[PDB]
C-alpha cells in the first residue's frame, strides 16, 4: 500500500531526493538510509549511532540520539507520520 | 545568493572535495566540473563529452552522456535539485 | 526501482556446495551493505549473513558460521554467498536484501527489499 507523508517528514524525504507525495514505507525509509548518510548524522565508527540532535530528523523522532538497531523510535515517528491513502 | 542542494547532488559535490551543505551556483558547477574529471566521466580524446551512464551523475541526471557545450541536461538538473536560502 | 534477482540455487546432497549469485539493480549497490537471508519450511526469515559496502568485512549466524562466505563484486553489482559442506539443515529458499540503513550488514528488518528467491535442497 500507499502513505502520504506529513509536510515535517515530507521535507526530508525531499530533500533526499523523493519525487512525488505518495510513497510506500519501504520507499520512505529508503529515503531516510540516504538522508542520513549523506548528511553524516551517524559516528563514522559506530555506524548504527545516529546523532540527529540539531536535525530537523531529531526533531521527527524526539531524540538526540539513537541506535538504529532499536526500531522504537522509528516505528513511533512513522505511525505519526504516515497517513495511509 | 545561497543555495542548499538536494542530498543526490550534495552526494556529488562533497565526492568532489566540498564541505557543508550551502554553496553559491557557480560552487556547484565548479564541484560538478571536479567531479566529472577526478571521476574520469569525459573521453580523453574528446574532453566536452561526458559519459555518466552507470554513474551518480548520469542517474541524477537520467542519461549516459552529454556535452559540456549544451548546458540543458545541466539546467533541469540544477532546477530540481538547488533550493534557494 | 530496486531490483534483486538470485540464482545458483538448486539440488544437493549432504557435503556438496552451490554458489548463490545476486543481481542488483535500481540502486547504488557500491554504497550499501547486503545481506544474505533464508526461509526454510515452517520457519520465518533467519538472516544468514552479511558483508559492508566495501567488501572488507563480514559477518555470519552461528548455525553457518566457518562454513559459508560473503563475498560481491561491485564492478558487476552482484552480491556471492559461497555454501560448502552443506547440510540438510541448510535446505531453503534463499534471498538476497538491500538494507534500508546503508551500514546495516549485522541484520535484517521489515523495511528492506529482497528479490523473490533462489531454492536450495539438500539430501
Known amino acids: 500500500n500507499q502513505v502520504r507523508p506529513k509536510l515535517p517528514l515530507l521535507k526530508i524525504l525531499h530533500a533526499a531526493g523523493a519525487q512525488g507525495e505518495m510513497f510506500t514505507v519501504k520507499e520512505v525509509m529508503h529515503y531516510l538510509g540516504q538522508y542520513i548518510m549523506v548528511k553524516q548524522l551517524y559516528d563514522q565508527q559506530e555506524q548504527h549511532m545516529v546523532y540527529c540532535g540539531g536535525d530537523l530528523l531529531g526533531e521527527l523522532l524526539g531524540r538526540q540520539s539513537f541506535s538504529v538497531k532499536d526500531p522504537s523510535p522509528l516505528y513511533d515517528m512513522l505511525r505519526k507520520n504516515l497517513v495511509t491513502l | 545568493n545561497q543555495v542548499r542542494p538536494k542530498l543526490p547532488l550534495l552526494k556529488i559535490l562533497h565526492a568532489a572535495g566540498a564541505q557543508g551543505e550551502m554553496f553559491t551556483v557557480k560552487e556547484v558547477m565548479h564541484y560538478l566540473g571536479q567531479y566529472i574529471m577526478v571521476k574520469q566521466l569525459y573521453d580523453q580524446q574528446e574532453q566536452h563529452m561526458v559519459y555518466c551512464g552507470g554513474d551518480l551523475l548520469g542517474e541524477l541526471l537520467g542519461r549516459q552522456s552529454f556535452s559540456v557545450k549544451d548546458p540543458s541536461p545541466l539546467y533541469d538538473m540544477l532546477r530540481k535539485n538547488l533550493v534557494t536560502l | 526501482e530496486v531490483q534483486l534477482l538470485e540464482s545458483g540455487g538448486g539440488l544437493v546432497q549432504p557435503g556438496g556446495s552451490l554458489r548463490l549469485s545476486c543481481a542488483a539493480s535500481?540502486?547504488?549497490?557500491?554504497?550499501?551493505?547486503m545481506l544474505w537471508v533464508r526461509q526454510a519450511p515452517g520457519k520465518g526469515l533467519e538472516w544468514v549473513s552479511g558483508?559492508?559496502?566495501?567488501?572488507?568485512?563480514?559477518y555470519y549466524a552461528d548455525s553457518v558460521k566457518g562454513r559459508f562466505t560473503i563475498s560481491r563484486d561491485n564492478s558487476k553489482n552482484t552480491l556471492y554467498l559461497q555454501m560448502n559442506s552443506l547440510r540438510t539443515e541448510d535446505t531453503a529458499v534463499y534471498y538476497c536484501?538491500?538494507?534500508?540503513?546503508?551500514?546495516?550488514?549485522?541484520?535484517?528488518?521489515?523495511?528492506?527489499?529482497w528479490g523473490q528467491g533462489t531454492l536450495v535442497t539438500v539430501s
Open positions: 536484501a538491500k538494507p534500508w540503513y546503508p551500514f546495516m550488514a549485522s541484520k535484517g528488518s521489515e523495511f528492506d527489499y
Open positions: 535500481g540502486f547504488t549497490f557500491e554504497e550499501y551493505a
Open positions: 558483508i559492508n559496502a566495501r567488501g572488507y568485512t563480514t
